[PDB]
Subunit: 386 residues, 4 copies
């Protein structure tokens, strides 16, 4: 009954189940979790693996000696459990030095420091077997218009990613980068605020093939955008390297609810798309168990993430396999959308009088699209009423 196994490739950040519940108006409600005990509990729940920021694993300020001991203990828990580490990332947002950004801070010495801190963790990520390195530029942005010349900031952002790409290629590392967009919070506006802006930026990097996106459900919904549409555009471009799954109720602060909460129908269409496009990367949950919960609620919330994915996967598969839905898709001409508009070419199109001079515009306009019947079949499948 909807039991996950490591083959489902569900992964969790250390910072998710480990969130202590500090919010802008309140103190922590839970004690800190040892990363080793998070790895063990997640493995018992059926997770495939974990992800980390450098500072989740190695306390900021650690000596190289304490650093080695933190990595060894972590490594041992991975060996004991069979858990993988498919992704890692850098914390360039918590320490006060990053208050105006890391890669795009106005102070040049901070930008250099941000790069060195990142490169140090790329080495560790490769040693732990990560295939994707995520960058979330949470402090890159501004609260006021004169504080940041955005063209100069984009030059500095390109410079930083180009240097990271030079570093990995000169070291011979098999790791790719994924940029995680977010429109706002904690800065008033964040640079590269949506999937689209990140995809466009990547095309100006020196080695674009090294870079993709790590979209997050709740972040695109903070701009009121359709998250499955944005994922479709990222798949179309060949750039969906990783994904952050969670829930969000509309345009407000980043809630990071468990996956399936928030916009449930969008979650259904997302799962339908990922499974039908054969996305084979990790199903990563970037979520926060609400601070109302004790540790039992933390693990219940994490389990719910995986459960809801598997229920939606079953419902989406039943939807696509239903002969009545396949009939309705043809009734709505989804088959015709997949056929070229003009494989006969420009000149044939220009000479084709059925395309314009003799086109019966009133008869075409009268044809219903039958989209409402199709959408009710999708609702019936989602609710198990079929």
């Amino acid at each position: 009954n909807y039991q996950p196994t490591p083959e489902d490739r569900f992964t969790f950040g250390l910072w998710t189940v480990g969130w202590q519940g500090r919010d802008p108006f309140g103190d922590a409600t839970r004690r800190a979790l040892d990363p080793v005990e998070s790895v063990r509990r997640l493995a018992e729940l059926g997770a495939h693996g974990v992800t980390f920021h450098d500072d989740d694993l190695i306390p900021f300020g650690s000596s190289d000696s304490e650093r080695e001991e933190h990595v060894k203990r972590f490594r041992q828990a991975l060996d004991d459990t069979g858990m993988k580490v498919p992704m890692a990332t850098t914390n360039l947002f918590t320490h006060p030095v990053f208050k105006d950004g890391g890669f795009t801070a106005n102070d040049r010495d901070v930008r250099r420091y941000a790069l060195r801190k990142t490169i140090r963790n790329i080495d560790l990520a490769v040693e732990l077997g990560a295939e994707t390195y995520v960058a979330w530029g949470g402090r890159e942005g501004a609260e006021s218009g004169g504080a940041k010349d955005v063209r100069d900031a984009l030059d500095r952002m390109k410079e930083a990613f180009d240097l990271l790409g030079e570093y990995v290629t000169s070291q011979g590392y098999d790791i790719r980068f994924a940029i995680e967009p977010k429109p706002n919070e904690p800065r008033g506006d964040i640079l590269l605020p949506t999937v689209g802006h990140a995809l466009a930026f990547i095309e100006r990097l020196e080695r674009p093939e090294l870079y993709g996106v790590n979209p997050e459900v709740g972040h695109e919904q903070m701009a009121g955008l359709n998250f499955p549409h944005g994922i479709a555009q990222a798949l179309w471009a060949g750039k969906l390297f990783h994904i952050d799954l969670n829930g969000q109720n509309g345009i407000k602060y980043d809630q990071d609810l468990r996956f399936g909460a928030g916009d449930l129908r969008a979650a259904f269409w997302l799962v339908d798309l990922l499974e039908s496009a054969g996305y084979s990367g990790p199903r990563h949950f970037d979520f926060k168990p609400p601070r109302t919960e004790d540790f039992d609620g933390v693990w219940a919330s994490a389990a719910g993430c995986m459960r809801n994915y598997l229920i939606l996967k079953e419902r989406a598969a039943a939807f696509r396999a239903d002969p009545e839905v396949q009939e309705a898709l043809r009734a709505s001409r989804l088959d015709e959308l997949a056929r070229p508009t003009a494989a006969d070419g420009l000149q044939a199109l220009l000479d084709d009088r059925s395309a314009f001079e003799e086109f019966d515009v009133d008869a075409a306009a009268a044809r219903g699209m039958a989209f409402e019947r199709l959408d009710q079949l999708a609702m019936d499948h989602l609710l198990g009423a079929r």
Copy 2:
């Protein structure tokens, strides 16, 4: 006192001052304007030129004979007034045949018709001297998730733009295309919903150099995004071919208020950017005089568009020229943002112990950014309190 002249390059759509005031809940409050009388009145107000959809100028269904007579009359008013036509576009949204889109309609015959209707107007646009051809895909999108496979739709959208690019290059026309994004309305979600998504899509076209964006103030604000930031990214990419100026009060239906209404501080930062980057295209107003107004209010609203641009231009220029602001910009290290992070290169950065091992992270963190003083100087300039 803030008087426009044709050298300011202010342009207006025929559909703007000509909007009759039909909204989803109400009938027209104004009679239709003859395009010839709009051209004359706009020239008296100091406009540089006008833009049109095919169907604003030539009533849908016109015979080639009536078509010639409509163009001749229009041509004569342009000659009489000195007005230019820098941009034109196609109406692929009003007629019922476009109810599921033009370029991405599920029905293949509608997509072919949409292309032929577009190509016919490109010829007319070139004959009238337009340099930019805008495409706003207002019906390309969906209200429900199963109605549109977005990857197939993006294939059809790329196919259509590629064919248009083949057409203009084979005819030898000097015209470029600009895609106008909008996140929603009239479809539940529109494809290419923001500047970012449009910029990313262009990079997958066969001849990307022919295509740029035509962002609109209110459209990016319907997603809660920072419009000057989005324009900065479009300028950074070399893709700001045209711009639609208006006002919008937040995330709601597309209001198309006169420019300067809505988010006034964003209008100030937009003008500052366009003038400081030397944008030399038309300052185009895509706005709707509210349906409360009679014809005197229509022309007052149009005049207000231009007036507010010129006032903000003066205030932004005074801001940038003020020695006290230039001092504050250095206090906030805007000069350092413009300098390379690591022109010394990767290996020098890796060897530079001042970048990491000996970097004083507490001293850097203690430095204030002085952004609030800078932003109050900007407020004082905007309000004329300096």
Copy 3:
């Protein structure tokens, strides 16, 4: 299998299935429906009744003679089908004379006309058996700040509702009024924009017992508000006289999707509340079949409204009846929320040292609320995974 009957009290506006599909950017895609044929088709689908604006039933400008003939034909279709008319309302928004409002128009003669037009329809509503008269002040509001002094406008709004209350009481009519809030569209901001503002306003009317609210799902969601919470406050105040059911995807133009579309989990919690509070008024659908659809899609969309209500009713009932959920509700102390904080009174509370001096604040803080387990049981019930 989820078949409606007239005992479910599902009702529809004539303007819903009769929407021709004109939107701000496009012409009608469907022909006009005769009200008699809407009544017949809705009765076949299992509806209980229909509602109308005056101008849906009697074309604006009709002579008293044509008016009688329109009502007679309508009356005959009601008799033929058994359909009821539980609610009626006035169109004070379509005609250009209402461009600045009806009850709060700046012109006094328009306000008087608006009142006479309303009173004429109240008489007709009573004759057809309506129990509720709805007022949606769609044009009451402003696009700019100086156009409307809101205190004077609220005086005029109170004056109008007070006069309507004097009219019904002096005629001896058994009808109550319900105000339908909406935050914006078609005006930039609409007066009384949410359930809360309408409830507060009612308390200042001369006979508050005659007035309640008619909230609409999509309207409160256009302000990002939680619609079941707002309904709970209206029930708490005793003011939920009627309700408009539909769907909305977030903060954007008013979509009026079929009920169950949009925010599905909010629809589940709404149905749970209405059924558990014993709301006994009509389940009214104020929705628009998308303009992509032909007439077959119109009736499919209407049928889907009722179907989704009945599926959610079944799932909510199963949720509340599940012993495991009843256990979880006690685990989360919902039982304790229903018990008085201090039935012992103020002085006892002040003397109770267990409430403060000896209260163990760390032990209380450590208690988890178990809300995530409860919410996953609700998800499992909604999806039929229980």
Copy 4:
């Protein structure tokens, strides 16, 4: 030049200039301020007074002995500077015990504790001379639908406010309560989310005359609502007891920018309303100097709050005094909005054939409202172009 004096009644929370800059993603960037040094610095800037939560002034957990010493030191700084304390409030949101609310927590013992903690601070507030006691129920709400039965929660909220009203009346205190609404953050949805919901709730309390609202600019804008309209409704009801002034850029997390930032035109219309209605309470700034700033930026930001209020006051006064604006207001019939619709009474209205049978609906509809000219005069005044 826009210099504040204590007669302008500008006040600040201790928690505003004292915000250390901890946000959900980052550590504090500033050291803690001693309340005594905040009082001194604010008095030098021209403030009238300060406000406090209990826990800003007395560290949570203090013994009665340390409590007396904290109050004495504070009292001495007030005497030294002449600063007043017009408002106080309770912190019912930071400590983990309040994670599910204070007055509406599901656990009954927490609700009792919340009341005792509040009553203790009401005594202190009265002793320091406060006239208004604010309640912001920041934790009253829910992230999921089953966690909170909102009708029971509103019963508990009414019970708590009724008890507080019984307490102040039995002690003979001259203090009134003001409820501060907020739609969300830190809870997913907060109870009483807007001005309207709070006004409606007050009317169900046992002694409604003791309770009003404390609206905050940014909070109503987090729901996309028009803040001057909401203030107008609160003034109309006689309930504007206090106000929180700040800035917000649209629908996102609560930014608490300095007043004048965010929506500048809304700030202008707010000041116009407060000054023209003769609001005589404190002008209170609930704002957070951004965490980019050091202490010099903190005081610059605070000074900017007051400066922008005084500039807008001057511009609004010039607008209303301008004969050309007074003419335009009559052109737009603002004078007619202020006149009764039907002071002649219902029967006269029903007999008045000029109101309906002989009303010329086409001639009334043709009249323009001249709102765009009026709004451009308002823009010219705001920008100092008049």
